[PDB]
Tab-separated table of C-alpha atoms and ligand atoms in Angstrom:
chain	number	residue	atom	x	y	z
A	1	UNK	CA	104.159	68.005	69.201
A	2	UNK	CA	106.315	71.124	69.839
A	3	UNK	CA	104.308	74.286	68.910
A	4	UNK	CA	106.431	76.757	66.764
A	5	UNK	CA	108.683	78.461	65.975
A	6	UNK	CA	106.615	81.677	65.454
A	7	UNK	CA	108.129	84.749	64.036
A	8	UNK	CA	108.719	88.010	66.191
A	9	UNK	CA	105.298	89.788	66.845
A	10	UNK	CA	103.157	91.493	69.532
A	11	UNK	CA	100.078	89.479	70.631
A	12	UNK	CA	97.955	88.671	73.677
A	13	UNK	CA	99.124	85.195	74.888
A	14	UNK	CA	96.581	83.169	76.723
A	15	UNK	CA	97.059	82.673	80.663
A	16	UNK	CA	98.855	79.615	81.821
A	17	UNK	CA	101.051	78.981	78.801
A	18	UNK	CA	104.820	79.428	78.629
A	19	UNK	CA	106.239	81.472	75.735
A	20	UNK	CA	109.526	79.970	75.119
A	21	UNK	CA	112.031	82.336	73.406
A	22	UNK	CA	114.988	81.334	71.310
A	23	UNK	CA	117.192	84.455	70.762
A	24	UNK	CA	120.281	84.474	68.612
A	25	UNK	CA	121.850	87.859	69.236
A	26	UNK	CA	122.519	89.796	72.592
A	27	UNK	CA	119.940	92.401	73.553
A	28	UNK	CA	116.273	92.709	74.264
A	29	UNK	CA	114.548	89.349	74.034
A	30	UNK	CA	110.828	90.102	74.899
A	31	UNK	CA	108.873	92.836	76.536
A	32	UNK	CA	105.303	93.166	78.201
A	33	UNK	CA	103.264	95.864	80.132
A	34	UNK	CA	99.816	96.325	81.518
A	35	UNK	CA	100.321	100.152	81.078
A	36	UNK	CA	99.488	100.859	84.755
A	37	UNK	CA	101.741	99.040	87.382
A	38	UNK	CA	103.971	96.761	85.536
A	39	UNK	CA	106.518	96.902	82.820
A	40	UNK	CA	109.051	93.947	82.098
A	41	UNK	CA	111.721	93.544	79.511
A	42	UNK	CA	114.209	90.742	79.478
A	43	UNK	CA	117.724	91.538	78.288
A	44	UNK	CA	120.147	88.942	77.301
A	45	UNK	CA	123.815	89.666	78.382
A	46	UNK	CA	126.918	88.137	76.820
A	47	UNK	CA	129.259	86.034	78.985
A	48	UNK	CA	131.949	87.944	81.122
A	49	UNK	CA	131.031	91.580	81.455
A	50	UNK	CA	132.312	93.924	84.074
A	51	UNK	CA	130.027	96.461	85.363
A	52	UNK	CA	129.336	99.087	82.349
A	53	UNK	CA	126.407	101.267	81.361
A	54	UNK	CA	124.652	100.451	78.105
A	55	UNK	CA	121.790	101.928	76.058
A	56	UNK	CA	118.785	99.953	75.286
A	57	UNK	CA	115.498	100.551	73.504
A	58	UNK	CA	112.924	99.600	75.820
A	59	UNK	CA	109.076	100.107	74.872
A	60	UNK	CA	110.204	102.325	72.017
A	61	UNK	CA	112.522	104.708	74.130
A	62	UNK	CA	116.207	104.794	74.664
A	63	UNK	CA	117.150	103.909	78.151
A	64	UNK	CA	120.539	103.754	80.055
A	65	UNK	CA	121.128	100.659	81.992
A	66	UNK	CA	124.099	99.416	84.165
A	67	UNK	CA	124.771	95.780	83.313
A	68	UNK	CA	127.194	93.119	84.440
A	69	UNK	CA	127.617	89.309	84.063
A	70	UNK	CA	129.974	87.638	86.360
A	71	UNK	CA	130.028	84.309	84.656
A	72	UNK	CA	132.902	83.546	82.439
A	73	UNK	CA	131.034	81.175	80.039
A	74	UNK	CA	127.348	81.634	80.685
A	75	UNK	CA	124.798	83.918	79.246
A	76	UNK	CA	122.689	86.156	81.835
A	77	UNK	CA	119.079	86.828	81.185
A	78	UNK	CA	117.985	89.919	83.136
A	79	UNK	CA	114.502	91.100	83.756
A	80	UNK	CA	114.337	94.954	83.977
A	81	UNK	CA	111.284	96.116	85.523
A	82	UNK	CA	109.439	99.345	86.517
A	83	UNK	CA	106.135	99.641	88.424
A	84	UNK	CA	104.995	102.999	87.416
A	85	UNK	CA	104.956	104.871	84.009
A	86	UNK	CA	107.875	107.230	84.872
A	87	UNK	CA	109.650	105.064	87.482
A	88	UNK	CA	113.216	103.868	87.267
A	89	UNK	CA	114.162	100.354	85.883
A	90	UNK	CA	115.221	97.734	88.587
A	91	UNK	CA	116.862	94.279	88.186
A	92	UNK	CA	115.802	91.087	90.034
A	93	UNK	CA	117.218	87.484	90.082
A	94	UNK	CA	118.933	86.431	86.918
A	95	UNK	CA	118.912	83.318	84.815
A	96	UNK	CA	122.457	82.112	84.037
A	97	UNK	CA	122.115	80.009	80.910
A	98	UNK	CA	124.199	77.664	78.820
A	99	UNK	CA	121.424	76.702	76.110
A	100	UNK	CA	120.336	80.501	75.476
A	101	UNK	CA	116.599	79.790	75.934
A	102	UNK	CA	114.229	81.623	78.296
A	103	UNK	CA	110.355	81.457	78.938
A	104	UNK	CA	107.595	83.910	80.223
A	105	UNK	CA	104.091	82.992	81.445
A	106	UNK	CA	101.050	84.948	82.651
A	107	UNK	CA	99.613	82.998	85.674
A	108	UNK	CA	97.535	83.810	88.833
A	109	UNK	CA	97.880	87.511	88.848
A	110	UNK	CA	101.540	87.598	88.026
A	111	UNK	CA	104.162	87.123	85.226
A	112	UNK	CA	106.403	84.292	85.781
A	113	UNK	CA	109.922	83.829	84.194
A	114	UNK	CA	112.701	81.188	84.641
A	115	UNK	CA	115.382	81.668	87.249
A	116	UNK	CA	118.832	80.501	88.707
A	117	UNK	CA	121.583	78.511	86.740
A	118	UNK	CA	121.233	75.827	84.047
A	119	UNK	CA	120.916	73.041	84.338
A	120	UNK	CA	119.187	73.292	87.688
A	121	UNK	CA	116.607	76.125	87.034
A	122	UNK	CA	113.737	77.294	89.074
A	123	UNK	CA	110.892	79.924	88.481
A	124	UNK	CA	110.145	83.427	89.858
A	125	UNK	CA	107.254	85.847	89.527
A	126	UNK	CA	106.085	89.472	89.547
A	127	UNK	CA	102.683	90.505	90.726
A	128	UNK	CA	100.823	92.197	87.788
A	129	UNK	CA	97.382	93.882	87.778
A	130	UNK	CA	95.150	92.845	84.974
A	131	UNK	CA	97.784	90.139	84.284
A	132	UNK	CA	95.534	88.347	81.790
A	133	UNK	CA	95.329	91.116	79.186
A	134	UNK	CA	99.120	91.680	79.244
A	135	UNK	CA	100.384	91.783	75.606
A	136	UNK	CA	103.831	90.381	74.860
A	137	UNK	CA	106.385	91.691	72.248
A	138	UNK	CA	108.808	88.964	71.072
A	139	UNK	CA	111.996	90.153	69.389
A	140	UNK	CA	112.944	86.631	68.283
A	141	UNK	CA	111.387	83.312	67.302
A	142	UNK	CA	109.152	81.639	69.970
A	143	UNK	CA	107.229	78.519	70.857
A	144	UNK	CA	104.004	78.035	73.005
A	145	UNK	CA	103.788	75.329	75.714
A	146	UNK	CA	100.871	74.753	78.048
A	147	UNK	CA	101.518	75.051	81.850
A	148	UNK	CA	100.322	71.365	82.142
A	149	UNK	CA	103.550	70.599	80.246
A	150	UNK	CA	105.821	72.831	82.229
A	151	UNK	CA	108.353	69.984	82.653
A	152	UNK	CA	108.974	69.869	78.914
A	153	UNK	CA	109.659	73.728	79.053
A	154	UNK	CA	111.926	73.216	82.026
A	155	UNK	CA	113.946	70.621	80.081
A	156	UNK	CA	114.442	73.087	77.163
A	157	UNK	CA	115.550	75.777	79.554
A	158	UNK	CA	118.025	73.475	81.223
A	159	UNK	CA	119.186	71.510	78.001
A	160	UNK	CA	118.318	73.349	74.866
A	161	UNK	CA	116.156	72.160	71.754
B	201	MN0	C1	105.517	92.089	95.979
B	201	MN0	O1	106.217	90.736	96.290
B	201	MN0	C2	106.845	90.194	95.009
B	201	MN0	C3	105.707	90.048	94.049
B	201	MN0	O2	104.751	89.214	94.246
B	201	MN0	O3	105.678	90.771	93.008
B	201	MN0	C4	107.229	88.779	95.411
B	201	MN0	C5	108.079	88.069	94.396
B	201	MN0	O4	108.882	86.895	94.859
B	201	MN0	C6	109.318	89.132	93.998
B	201	MN0	N1	109.910	88.609	92.707
B	201	MN0	C7	111.325	88.664	92.580
B	201	MN0	O5	112.141	89.062	93.508
B	201	MN0	C8	111.652	87.838	91.398
B	201	MN0	O6	113.141	87.863	91.325
B	201	MN0	C9	108.674	90.439	93.553
B	201	MN0	C10	109.510	91.586	92.919
B	201	MN0	O7	110.366	92.022	93.967
B	201	MN0	C11	108.806	92.763	92.486
B	201	MN0	O8	107.481	92.357	91.677
B	201	MN0	C12	109.601	93.656	91.572
B	201	MN0	O9	108.811	94.925	91.059
B	201	MN0	O10	107.796	91.131	94.559
């Protein structure tokens, strides 16, 4: 019944569907923009990292970002966001994860991602103009899950495939 895995690509996902991402290596997991007031890129950070500046390619250009992960044993998924073309990148609420899975959804004028610490995750959102036409670039294999089945996606985030 599980819909995937799909290979890395750029496409325009339907609204009200979770794109469940299964990265294997540290680094950029997925990116999305409306080209006007919202840019979002999720970075997967290794367990146990003291504050350091790193370089990432985001939307095809090199960017310097200060990263940390206080967890000894858990991964850290960080959404790096800007709200204008030339604006600086900011970080908001992470997901600390054992299973190494993440998800993103276009819903109700916003982009939603998962949040908190496995195995007790929640969701968070970012208001996004023209939310429905946002193209997403996946840099790893992914699956597609309807919002109606959100509880299944939440189980995967919490517990793995
Ligand atoms: C304007 O308010 C909001 C938004 O509706 O967007 C509320 C939302 O909870 C918040 N999300 C979080 O803090 C997620 O951790 C979001 C966020 O600060 C900005 O979108 C960042 O650019 O701002």
